[PDB]
Structures are given as C-alpha cells and as structure tokens.
Design a binder for this molecule. Sequence first.
Ligand SMILES: *CCC(=O)Nc1cnc2onc(C)c2c1
Length: 346
Amino acid sequence: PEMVRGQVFDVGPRYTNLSYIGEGAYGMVCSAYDNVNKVRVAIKKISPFEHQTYCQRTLREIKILLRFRHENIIGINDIIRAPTIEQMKDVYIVQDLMETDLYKLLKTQHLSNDHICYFLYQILRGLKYIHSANVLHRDLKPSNLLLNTTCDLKICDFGLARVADPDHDHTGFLTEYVATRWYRAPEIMLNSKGYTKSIDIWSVGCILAEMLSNRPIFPGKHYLDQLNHILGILGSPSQEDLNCIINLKARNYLLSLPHKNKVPWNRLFPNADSKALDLLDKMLTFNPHKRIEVEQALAHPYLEQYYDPSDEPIAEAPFKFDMELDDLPKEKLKELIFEETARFQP
Ligand SMILES: *CCC(=O)Nc1cnc2onc(C)c2c1
C-alpha cells in the first residue's frame, strides 16, 4: 500500500501517482491519477470509527452527497474501504479534482464583477437544490466552495447539514453553536438553533460581501463579538425587529447596547455594482423572517444574465435521516457507513 508523508494512503491500484495536497476538516487529502477514467481526482482519507461525532458527520456527508445530483454540488465518484466491517479502518472518498476553492482565491486574486456575479449565481443555484430537498447546509463559507480551472463552482462539506425544522428553531440567548463563526446569522447568538433556510442565506450574504472586498465582512473573534460586528454595520435593530425576539435575555441584551447607525453598503463597497449591493442588503437582513429566500435571490436583477428557473433544478424528493443520528452508538454508526458505502464494492 502506498504511503504519503509517512502515513498509509491506501487507494488500491485504481488510483496511483499520489501527490499530497494538504489537510482538511476530515484528515489527509491527495490528488491521484484515476487509471479507469484517465483523469486526476481528489481523494480524502477519513478515520472516524472511534469517535461518535466524526462518525455522525462522515455518515451525514456520505448519505447527502450520494443522494444529491447537481452541477453545483460536489459528487462522490467512488468510496474505498475494506471488504468487511472488521477490517474497515479508513474510508477514502474520491471526488472530482478542483483547481482551488474560494478561500484560496480570495486570499490571492481580485475578482471581476463578472466573476462575482457568476460565482454568486452558481452558489444560489446549488443552494436552491439543497433547500428544495429540505436540507440546510449550515456551514457555507469560502473554503466550502470549490472551483475548477474554468470557474465552475461546487458546494462541498455537508458534515453539519440538517433537515430543516423551523417549528423547533427557538432557543435561549447565547446557545452554543458549531458552524463557522464569521458566517453565523445574528439570530444564532440570540434565539435560533439554525434549523431554517434563512441561516444559509445569511452565510451567502457574508460570502458575497467577502467577494466584493476580499476580506470577511464580520470577523468576530469570539461568540458574542460576532453579533457586535454584525450590529456595527447593520446598525441597531428596529423596534419591530426587536419585538420579534420574544426571549427576554436576548431582547434586553440588544436594548442595553448604545444606538448604532447603519453603515451604507456603498461606503463599505465603493467599487461594487449597485444591483450587487441591493441583493447583499436583502441577504444580510437582521430579521430572518424578512431575509430574502434562495429563489427570490436567483430572480434578483443582479443575476438577470443567468436567471433561468427551468435550468435551476430541484431535488426529486425531500431528504430524510431515517434514524436520529444524534444518539447512535459508535459501533452502529460504523455499520451504517459500511452499508452506505456498499455500492462501490466490486
Ligand atoms: C469541502 C472542502 C473540500 O473538499 N476541499 C477540497 C480541497 N481540494 C480539493 O481538490 N479537489 C477537491 C474535490 C477538493 C476539495
């Protein structure tokens, strides 16, 4: 079995000529030549079977990605693992090789308005499909958006995804949250579990702002600082938007703050297209009930060059986790991953 930086990276004879790319959320990632399709591919190594949380997220990613089929969502091409549960230690997930991600691109490259518009269209096109399946991505951010050499964009990492559950979205003030801090909607810190589609639109709004300036719009350094970044640009919420927050600890926190005025978008982004800033405003709305939905966002004048609902497909059915993955033991989740990956065995 081949090794990479002194570690087993055991992808059978189908995949050869490994080149270390780097580490990701799950573990080691290499490119390799796929001797069947005659193209280089990306392979990530996962070792999740001791920890219930890595198990849960790995199973979530696999079940979703195998069920989804969309041009702006990364697919799984192949999964490599041992033939029996007893011998299964690692799982290798094979995907299309992509030149870069939007995180790396934003660190190194100025984007033309045309590139911003095209990227945003593709993000929303993919998001339309995910939401149509009643799924929330819940961790949209530049590093989860992959690009190829021709700027085709694919959303990746469904490890934190959930089935939407708006009726159970309410929580108390300062409730801990898992998803990446700088892309968290204000309501996460106030009264939301992130179980509604509006959570993902906020993240997309944050990504659009980051494309406009190459800098994160709300780089909070800790849980509550994230809310204070957001309010520093949006300004103080209105009476009406405050009244929608029934929880007294959250309400009274907001009432305790000094009055902050809105920073106009055209002063933060003096080079931006005015239609881009109109759409940005609508995605970065404080009140999640007033926030634009994915289909409205696609229909916004900024995206007129691309908008075509007949070419923005939806999922054939809503997605469902058959068992509640949250309280399954470690051995049961390994068996589930074994079963979910069976279709790739010879
Ligand atoms: C979702 C994050 C991710 O998969 N990152 C990534 C990095 N480098 C890559 O090269 N090919 C692919 C498919 C990727 C993904």
